[PDB]
Amino acid sequence: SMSEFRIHHDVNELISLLHVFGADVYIDLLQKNRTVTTSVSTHSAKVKIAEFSRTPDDFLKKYEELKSKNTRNLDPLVYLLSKLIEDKETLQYLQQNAKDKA
Amino acid sequence: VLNPEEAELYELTQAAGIVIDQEVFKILVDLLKMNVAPLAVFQMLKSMCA
Numbered sequence: 001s002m003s004e005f006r007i008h009h010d011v012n013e014l015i016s017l018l019h020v021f022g023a024d025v026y027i028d029l030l031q032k033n034r035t036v037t038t039s040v041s042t043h044s045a046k047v048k049i050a051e052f053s054r055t056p057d058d059f060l061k062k063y064e065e066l067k068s069k070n071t072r073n074l075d076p077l078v079y080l081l082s083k084l085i086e087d088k089e090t091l092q093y094l095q096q097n098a099k100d101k102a
Numbered sequence: 103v104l105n106p107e108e109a110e111l112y113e114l115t116q117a118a119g120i121v122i123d124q125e126v127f128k129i130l131v132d133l134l135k136m137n138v139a140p141l142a143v144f145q146m147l148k149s150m151c152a
Binding site: 003004006007010011013014015017018020024025026029030032033034035049052053054055058062063067071072073074075076078079080081083084085087089090091093094097098101102 | 104105107110111113114115117118119120121122124125126129131132134135136137138139140141142143144145146147148149150151152
């Protein structure tokens with residue numbers, strides 16, 4: 001319950017922060033969240049990022065800095081960034097929404 | 103805005119080539135922290151945009 005509250009707050013401030021708007025689907029979508037990454041998946045994702053970015057060493061070098069520390073959700077966050085490179089439209093929105101807030 | 107732990111991950115995504123403003127980055131990280139699948143985060147992010 002007080003879990004779901006936090007999810008709703010998160011959905012809500014994004015709607016606010018991204019200038020949106022039925023977002024009850026996002027609640028259902030985010031509420032199927034059952035636990036498992038693979039060793040290739042993070043490799044597959046990781047090579048795809050390094051292709052995309054300029055300065056790929058910086059990404060890889062601080063991937064390395066930050067895996068030795070076991071920092072939390074490192075690999076699911078890197079999987080997300082690979083997924084974001086693919087969809088060039090929503091990559092650009094996030095790109096722009098950040099220009100708006102400076 | 104966001105703390106040493108999140109500051110690292112932001113720098114990571116940053117040198118990874120993407121830029122998203124610290125405020126939404128913080129929430130994403132948080133959605134991950136509450137064990138939401140990255141794909142689910144991505145899917146809703148995709149829907150929330152154009």
